[PDB]
Amino acid sequence: TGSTDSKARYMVAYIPPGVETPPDTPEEAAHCIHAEWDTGLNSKFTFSIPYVSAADYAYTASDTAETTNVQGWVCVYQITHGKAENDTLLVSASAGKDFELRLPIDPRTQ
Amino acid sequence: DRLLTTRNGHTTSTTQSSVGVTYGYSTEEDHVAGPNTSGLETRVVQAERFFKKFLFDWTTDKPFGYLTKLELPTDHHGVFGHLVDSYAYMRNGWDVEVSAVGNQFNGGCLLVAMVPEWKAFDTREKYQLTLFPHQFISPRTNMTAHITVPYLGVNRYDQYKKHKPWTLVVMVLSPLTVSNTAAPQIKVYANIAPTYVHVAGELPSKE
Amino acid sequence: DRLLTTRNGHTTSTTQSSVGVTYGYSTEEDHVAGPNTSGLETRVVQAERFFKKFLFDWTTDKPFGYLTKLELPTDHHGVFGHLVDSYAYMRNGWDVEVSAVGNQFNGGCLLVAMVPEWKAFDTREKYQLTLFPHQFISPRTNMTAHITVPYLGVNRYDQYKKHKPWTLVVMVLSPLTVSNTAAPQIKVYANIAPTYVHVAGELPSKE
Amino acid sequence: TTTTGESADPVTTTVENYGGDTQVQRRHHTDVGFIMDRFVKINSLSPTHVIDLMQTHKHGIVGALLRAATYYFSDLEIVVRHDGNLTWVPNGAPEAALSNTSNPTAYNKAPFTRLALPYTAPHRVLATVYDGTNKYSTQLPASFNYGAIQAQAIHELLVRMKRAELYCPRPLLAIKVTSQDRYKQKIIAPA
Amino acid sequence: TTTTGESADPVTTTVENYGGDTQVQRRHHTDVGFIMDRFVKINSLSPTHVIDLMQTHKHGIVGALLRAATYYFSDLEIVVRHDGNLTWVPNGAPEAALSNTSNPTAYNKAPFTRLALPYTAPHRVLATVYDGTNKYSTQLPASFNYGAIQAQAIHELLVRMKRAELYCPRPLLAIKVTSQDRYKQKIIAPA
Amino acid sequence: SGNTGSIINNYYMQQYQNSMSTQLGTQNNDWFSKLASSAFTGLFGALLA
Amino acid sequence: SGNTGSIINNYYMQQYQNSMSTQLGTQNNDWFSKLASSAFTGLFGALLA
């Protein structure tokens, strides 16, 4: 969302489960599946969080007994920037081509 | 002559008292590229070689039912071990060779088997351990047992840090017998090699 | 639009101010299966991905000739680093990307080059560094430099613990200029990926 | 992939970008007609009740989904547990007609009455929200209904949307999350 | 026949070795799908119950046989004798969902409710034993279930395995024998 | 249909079982299906794999 | 099947009556049937009858 004279370089990484806490450094996260992009004429960048798990399906809800997230984390980093202080990066989500939901449920309190 | 020389990567092993290879549950692996890893898995051939592990000392005082187990995967300090710390998910089968060398003047018999999803067995259940992939070792006939099994489990890929699908067991079926001309005891060793090693989900570095 | 998106393994990188890729000395690797490793070498594709390294802060006070170097391979805590501790010999090339992001209101120019067999250069020799595979970074034009080089050396395979064939250098050609509308300083980063990674000579475990 | 986001043109990347394999999807459960086709209960009741799908609970699967659409259409099924006989009357009828037996009247048969009713509004489609300055000669036009039922007492009412059609999607919200990371709750597990 | 027994290769001799005639066998009753296809009761119950086949008795024909396998798969049928209405919810659902009527809910009809339910676990197959070092984020993963049921009171629960598949056999034991020769018991006989 | 799984044909005629639709002109007037299928999937720019 | 003995075809469709299996590649993947059929039945050595 920055002005024409604001530049930056970002990185997004998918940290799979198996580590206790996500890395707060691009250097450590580099070993994971990741993508880096910079600022320019095209303002948007899209990345696919892959489905990598033990079972073929994963629960949409989370159990109270879960400490660490069963499916891992996503970490967004800022490699650097040039005069981009206070400038923004909007982030949104959408279903991918093979996203699938099964087994209808009526869970909300009524 | 019952000669068999097995090769896994840059490591080979040969016996001159082979009684064959026992394949358990299947002759091949099921599909390694399923929907659970999207298309991100890869095979790592460098991990497909023999590593070693001492099991136990087969002595005259160990009676029928005496049993030693080794849950797989076990501690590994080679490339396979690194794989476990570097990837979130894995799958592989096992090519297992177990040697109990004494001499032809010893007697007795060991049952070597591969068990999926281990549970401590009753002494009565021990009479049916042959329901699992197995082979025997009797000094009058052989010094080596060889079993090959595929990867299995409720999940197509696993987290070995939380679950161990296979477990090697060696049980005394008939006590070791010795004489003046026989070896006084027999040490039992395992020569194991993981097969069709696949990993998915690169983990971050420790830094 | 000068868009380039590079992919190495499960890692990708894209710039919108690309000035192209500079290939040094060759477009391809020479033969990786020579007589020195008999037929025991293997490729390890899992090591072919991007790792990161901070280079230096490009500031207004750094004059022509100021130079930062990074000898390759450098400390690595991923699969490539493990490879170095697990095999006696290795070879690979490098796919190098260097970013110096400030803004279009900055001035100055950095020379980024790849040098085989490094030696500390005189200030007079610094005028001929363009004899090596290189590219420039000038804020008015680009933020990214990209160079790709093959493996080389008197030996077809190497012992990186004793010798480092390639070394990345970034030298100030014309000092950084700033204004009210410009970035006050520019941090310089490297995004590197080893290419065609081959290893030979499995080493024993530490146990 | 980078694109001109200001245009709002849809962009769907895949794992192939970094070497993955996109898989096969089976989306039967997210099919609109299928998902809306199940009984939902109407809590407020009375001896005389005008069938209005908006009386459905806002957080139930059907009510949440219906409200996530601006316009809709459907036929209907109702299950009514009642004392005495049940009379139904179509959209547009005088409330007084409910007392007359020649309108569809179901004679009491235990344990309840299940019925199939047709859409009956004078509009081509109905709405869940209506921006009227008034709409007269957070309120919906009175013509937005599926008729009305009457019995000596109405104890329970279930309603089912048949052949549902949904148009122009609206916001659908999950439970507000208080926790630092995820909304956690007790998921079923064996004892 | 003599053979190298250490190899563990199967050997099946016949009476022909000494002059007999091997006969015809009909093995329908030992067919896995057939034998597992009958109702078995679950003793422990409660107003809220998570369906887990391992709650089956270890010595009953179905429970003994199921435990004599490592992995299995099947669809299911349940007979439930309950007070009020019965609600079922699939594997992975918040326990709280059991109170909502839009999940499959069977209205009370004497004398009990019989239902056909599909396999619903996120795994390709389930297990009767699981060698987990832990298995967290003699215990089985919580994901190993066929959903859950709830009613005001659950008096009786019968369960039936449909299309059963069994893999990797395990020990199956007969009654421990104390007698010097045979385990003797009272076999039915006319008066 | 959607959530009807009976094999046997209905005992009642369609004009009784349901209201009857009329037209002026169920076709492919599925805006969102079109919208989703039109989504850009490529990669803008040059690639180095 | 196994322990179903009704002649008349089911009133409900298969996708309702049962879960639907999917594949990646009911075949002859019957390990134990193969194992049993492979059993040695002969007589090792020479015979004098």
Short mmCIF file of N, CA, C and O in Angstrom, two decimals, chain A residues 4-9 11 26-27 29-45 47 78-83 85, chain C residues 1 3 10-17 49-52 54 76-78 97 99 101-105 143-144 180-183 187 189 191:
data_model
loop_
_atom_site.label_atom_id
_atom_site.label_comp_id
_atom_site.label_asym_id
_atom_site.label_seq_id
_atom_site.Cartn_x
_atom_site.Cartn_y
_atom_site.Cartn_z
N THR A 4 4.79 5.66 -4.14
CA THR A 4 5.71 5.28 -5.20
C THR A 4 7.17 5.27 -4.75
O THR A 4 7.95 4.47 -5.23
N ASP A 5 7.51 6.15 -3.81
CA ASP A 5 8.88 6.25 -3.31
C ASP A 5 9.21 5.37 -2.09
O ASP A 5 10.25 5.55 -1.45
N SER A 6 8.30 4.44 -1.79
CA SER A 6 8.47 3.49 -0.69
C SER A 6 8.73 2.12 -1.31
O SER A 6 7.96 1.66 -2.15
N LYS A 7 9.82 1.49 -0.91
CA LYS A 7 10.19 0.18 -1.44
C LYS A 7 10.48 -0.83 -0.34
O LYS A 7 10.86 -0.45 0.77
N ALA A 8 10.25 -2.10 -0.63
CA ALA A 8 10.50 -3.15 0.35
C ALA A 8 10.66 -4.53 -0.27
O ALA A 8 10.31 -4.76 -1.43
N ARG A 9 11.21 -5.45 0.52
CA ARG A 9 11.40 -6.83 0.09
C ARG A 9 10.89 -7.74 1.21
O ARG A 9 11.30 -7.63 2.35
N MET A 11 9.18 -11.78 2.57
CA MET A 11 9.37 -13.22 2.51
C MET A 11 8.26 -13.88 3.30
O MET A 11 7.88 -13.39 4.36
N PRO A 26 14.59 -14.61 9.10
CA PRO A 26 14.49 -15.07 7.71
C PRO A 26 15.55 -16.16 7.43
O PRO A 26 15.31 -17.12 6.69
N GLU A 27 16.70 -16.01 8.08
CA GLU A 27 17.80 -16.95 7.91
C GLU A 27 17.46 -18.38 8.34
O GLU A 27 17.84 -19.34 7.66
N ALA A 29 14.23 -19.49 8.75
CA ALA A 29 13.06 -19.87 7.98
C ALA A 29 13.37 -20.20 6.53
O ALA A 29 12.55 -20.83 5.86
N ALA A 30 14.56 -19.83 6.06
CA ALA A 30 14.96 -20.07 4.67
C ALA A 30 14.94 -21.54 4.31
O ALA A 30 14.65 -21.91 3.18
N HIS A 31 15.21 -22.39 5.29
CA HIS A 31 15.23 -23.82 5.07
C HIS A 31 13.87 -24.47 4.84
O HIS A 31 13.77 -25.64 4.48
N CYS A 32 12.81 -23.68 5.04
CA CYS A 32 11.46 -24.15 4.81
C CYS A 32 11.05 -23.75 3.38
O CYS A 32 11.83 -23.15 2.63
N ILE A 33 9.83 -24.13 3.02
CA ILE A 33 9.24 -23.77 1.75
C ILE A 33 8.95 -22.27 1.93
O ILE A 33 8.31 -21.86 2.90
N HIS A 34 9.49 -21.44 1.04
CA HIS A 34 9.26 -20.01 1.17
C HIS A 34 9.36 -19.28 -0.15
O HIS A 34 9.87 -19.80 -1.14
N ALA A 35 8.90 -18.03 -0.14
CA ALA A 35 8.94 -17.18 -1.31
C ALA A 35 9.30 -15.77 -0.86
O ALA A 35 8.85 -15.28 0.18
N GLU A 36 10.13 -15.12 -1.67
CA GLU A 36 10.56 -13.76 -1.42
C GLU A 36 10.11 -12.92 -2.60
O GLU A 36 10.16 -13.37 -3.74
N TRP A 37 9.66 -11.70 -2.35
CA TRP A 37 9.28 -10.84 -3.45
C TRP A 37 9.56 -9.39 -3.08
O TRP A 37 9.75 -9.05 -1.92
N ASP A 38 9.66 -8.54 -4.09
CA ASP A 38 9.88 -7.14 -3.82
C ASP A 38 8.77 -6.28 -4.37
O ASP A 38 7.83 -6.74 -5.02
N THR A 39 8.89 -5.01 -4.06
CA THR A 39 7.94 -4.00 -4.44
C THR A 39 8.17 -3.51 -5.88
O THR A 39 9.29 -3.51 -6.39
N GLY A 40 7.09 -3.10 -6.53
CA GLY A 40 7.22 -2.59 -7.89
C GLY A 40 5.89 -2.21 -8.53
O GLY A 40 4.94 -1.88 -7.83
N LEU A 41 5.82 -2.31 -9.85
CA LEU A 41 4.59 -1.96 -10.57
C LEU A 41 3.36 -2.79 -10.15
O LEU A 41 2.24 -2.28 -10.12
N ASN A 42 3.57 -4.09 -9.90
CA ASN A 42 2.49 -4.97 -9.47
C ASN A 42 2.50 -4.95 -7.96
O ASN A 42 3.50 -5.30 -7.34
N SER A 43 1.38 -4.54 -7.38
CA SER A 43 1.23 -4.40 -5.94
C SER A 43 0.87 -5.64 -5.14
O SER A 43 1.00 -5.64 -3.92
N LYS A 44 0.40 -6.68 -5.81
CA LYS A 44 -0.02 -7.88 -5.12
C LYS A 44 0.84 -9.11 -5.39
O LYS A 44 1.41 -9.26 -6.46
N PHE A 45 0.98 -9.96 -4.38
CA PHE A 45 1.73 -11.20 -4.51
C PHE A 45 0.89 -12.27 -3.84
O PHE A 45 0.33 -12.05 -2.76
N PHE A 47 0.58 -16.42 -2.62
CA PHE A 47 1.33 -17.60 -2.22
C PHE A 47 0.38 -18.70 -1.72
O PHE A 47 -0.62 -18.42 -1.05
N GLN A 78 10.17 -9.27 6.76
CA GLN A 78 10.55 -8.09 6.03
C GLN A 78 12.07 -8.17 5.93
O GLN A 78 12.77 -8.04 6.93
N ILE A 79 12.57 -8.49 4.73
CA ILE A 79 14.01 -8.59 4.50
C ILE A 79 14.65 -7.21 4.73
O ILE A 79 15.65 -7.11 5.44
N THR A 80 14.07 -6.18 4.11
CA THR A 80 14.50 -4.78 4.23
C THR A 80 13.43 -3.89 3.65
O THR A 80 12.43 -4.37 3.11
N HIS A 81 13.70 -2.60 3.68
CA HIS A 81 12.82 -1.60 3.11
C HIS A 81 13.63 -0.33 2.92
O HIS A 81 14.70 -0.17 3.51
N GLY A 82 13.15 0.54 2.04
CA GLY A 82 13.80 1.81 1.79
C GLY A 82 12.71 2.85 1.89
O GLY A 82 11.80 2.86 1.06
N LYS A 83 12.75 3.66 2.95
CA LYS A 83 11.75 4.72 3.16
C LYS A 83 10.31 4.20 3.21
O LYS A 83 9.37 4.90 2.82
N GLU A 85 8.74 3.21 6.11
CA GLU A 85 8.24 3.30 7.49
C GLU A 85 6.77 3.68 7.48
O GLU A 85 6.36 4.59 6.73
N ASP C 1 8.23 -2.84 -17.06
CA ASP C 1 8.35 -4.06 -16.20
C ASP C 1 9.52 -4.98 -16.55
O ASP C 1 9.67 -5.43 -17.69
N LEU C 3 10.43 -8.05 -14.73
CA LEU C 3 10.13 -9.09 -13.77
C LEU C 3 10.79 -10.42 -13.97
O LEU C 3 10.61 -11.07 -14.99
N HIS C 10 12.11 -25.86 -3.40
CA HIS C 10 10.84 -25.35 -2.90
C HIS C 10 10.95 -23.90 -2.44
O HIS C 10 10.22 -23.47 -1.54
N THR C 11 11.88 -23.16 -3.02
CA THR C 11 12.07 -21.76 -2.68
C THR C 11 12.10 -20.94 -3.96
O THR C 11 12.67 -21.35 -4.95
N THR C 12 11.41 -19.81 -3.94
CA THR C 12 11.37 -18.93 -5.10
C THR C 12 11.67 -17.50 -4.67
O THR C 12 11.48 -17.13 -3.50
N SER C 13 12.12 -16.69 -5.62
CA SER C 13 12.42 -15.28 -5.38
C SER C 13 12.07 -14.47 -6.62
O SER C 13 12.41 -14.87 -7.72
N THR C 14 11.35 -13.36 -6.45
CA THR C 14 11.01 -12.52 -7.60
C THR C 14 11.28 -11.03 -7.41
O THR C 14 11.07 -10.51 -6.32
N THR C 15 11.84 -10.39 -8.44
CA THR C 15 12.14 -8.95 -8.45
C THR C 15 11.31 -8.34 -9.54
O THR C 15 11.02 -8.99 -10.53
N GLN C 16 11.06 -7.05 -9.40
CA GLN C 16 10.32 -6.33 -10.42
C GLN C 16 11.27 -5.29 -11.05
O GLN C 16 10.85 -4.45 -11.85
N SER C 17 12.55 -5.35 -10.68
CA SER C 17 13.57 -4.45 -11.22
C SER C 17 14.80 -5.30 -11.56
O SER C 17 15.88 -5.13 -11.01
N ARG C 49 18.54 -25.12 -2.80
CA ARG C 49 17.54 -24.13 -2.42
C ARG C 49 18.27 -22.90 -1.90
O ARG C 49 19.46 -22.95 -1.62
N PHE C 50 17.52 -21.82 -1.74
CA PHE C 50 18.07 -20.55 -1.27
C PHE C 50 18.31 -20.44 0.23
O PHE C 50 17.46 -20.84 1.02
N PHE C 51 19.47 -19.92 0.62
CA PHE C 51 19.77 -19.65 2.02
C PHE C 51 20.12 -18.16 2.03
O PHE C 51 20.38 -17.58 0.97
N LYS C 52 20.09 -17.53 3.20
CA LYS C 52 20.31 -16.09 3.26
C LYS C 52 21.48 -15.58 4.07
O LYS C 52 21.92 -16.22 5.02
N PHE C 54 23.33 -11.64 5.34
CA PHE C 54 23.45 -10.18 5.33
C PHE C 54 24.88 -9.85 4.93
O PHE C 54 25.82 -10.53 5.34
N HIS C 76 26.59 -22.93 7.02
CA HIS C 76 25.26 -23.33 6.60
C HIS C 76 24.70 -24.31 7.62
O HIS C 76 25.35 -25.28 7.98
N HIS C 77 23.46 -24.07 8.03
CA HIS C 77 22.81 -24.91 9.03
C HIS C 77 21.65 -25.74 8.51
O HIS C 77 20.84 -26.24 9.30
N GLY C 78 21.60 -25.90 7.19
CA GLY C 78 20.56 -26.68 6.54
C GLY C 78 21.14 -27.97 5.99
O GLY C 78 22.20 -28.42 6.46
N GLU C 97 21.92 -14.06 -5.86
CA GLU C 97 21.06 -12.89 -6.01
C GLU C 97 21.44 -11.93 -4.88
O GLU C 97 21.57 -12.33 -3.73
N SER C 99 20.37 -8.01 -3.41
CA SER C 99 19.38 -6.95 -3.30
C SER C 99 19.93 -5.77 -2.50
O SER C 99 20.76 -5.93 -1.61
N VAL C 101 18.04 -2.60 -1.51
CA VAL C 101 16.87 -1.75 -1.62
C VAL C 101 16.84 -0.48 -0.80
O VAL C 101 16.99 -0.50 0.43
N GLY C 102 16.74 0.63 -1.53
CA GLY C 102 16.62 1.97 -0.98
C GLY C 102 15.44 2.47 -1.79
O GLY C 102 14.38 1.85 -1.77
N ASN C 103 15.59 3.60 -2.47
CA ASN C 103 14.52 4.05 -3.35
C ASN C 103 15.07 4.73 -4.60
O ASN C 103 16.29 4.81 -4.77
N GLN C 104 14.20 5.15 -5.50
CA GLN C 104 14.66 5.76 -6.73
C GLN C 104 15.29 7.15 -6.59
O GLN C 104 15.82 7.70 -7.56
N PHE C 105 15.26 7.71 -5.38
CA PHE C 105 15.85 9.03 -5.16
C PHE C 105 17.28 8.98 -4.59
O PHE C 105 17.87 10.02 -4.28
N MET C 143 17.38 -2.85 -8.07
CA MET C 143 17.60 -3.16 -6.67
C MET C 143 18.21 -4.56 -6.53
O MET C 143 18.69 -4.92 -5.46
N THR C 144 18.20 -5.32 -7.62
CA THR C 144 18.71 -6.68 -7.60
C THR C 144 19.77 -6.96 -8.65
O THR C 144 19.67 -6.48 -9.77
N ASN C 180 16.36 14.43 0.86
CA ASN C 180 15.21 14.39 1.76
C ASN C 180 14.21 13.33 1.37
O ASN C 180 13.53 12.75 2.23
N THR C 181 14.13 13.07 0.08
CA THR C 181 13.19 12.09 -0.45
C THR C 181 13.76 10.67 -0.56
O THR C 181 13.02 9.72 -0.81
N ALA C 182 15.05 10.51 -0.28
CA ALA C 182 15.71 9.21 -0.39
C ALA C 182 15.83 8.44 0.91
O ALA C 182 15.63 8.97 1.99
N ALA C 183 16.14 7.15 0.77
CA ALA C 183 16.35 6.29 1.91
C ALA C 183 17.71 6.75 2.45
O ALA C 183 18.62 7.02 1.68
N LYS C 187 20.63 -1.41 3.20
CA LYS C 187 21.21 -2.66 3.70
C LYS C 187 21.32 -3.61 2.51
O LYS C 187 20.41 -3.69 1.69
N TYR C 189 21.72 -7.42 1.09
CA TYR C 189 21.54 -8.84 1.40
C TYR C 189 21.81 -9.76 0.22
O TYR C 189 21.68 -9.38 -0.94
N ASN C 191 21.00 -13.70 -1.40
CA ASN C 191 20.09 -14.84 -1.43
C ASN C 191 20.85 -15.81 -2.33
O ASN C 191 20.96 -15.58 -3.54
#
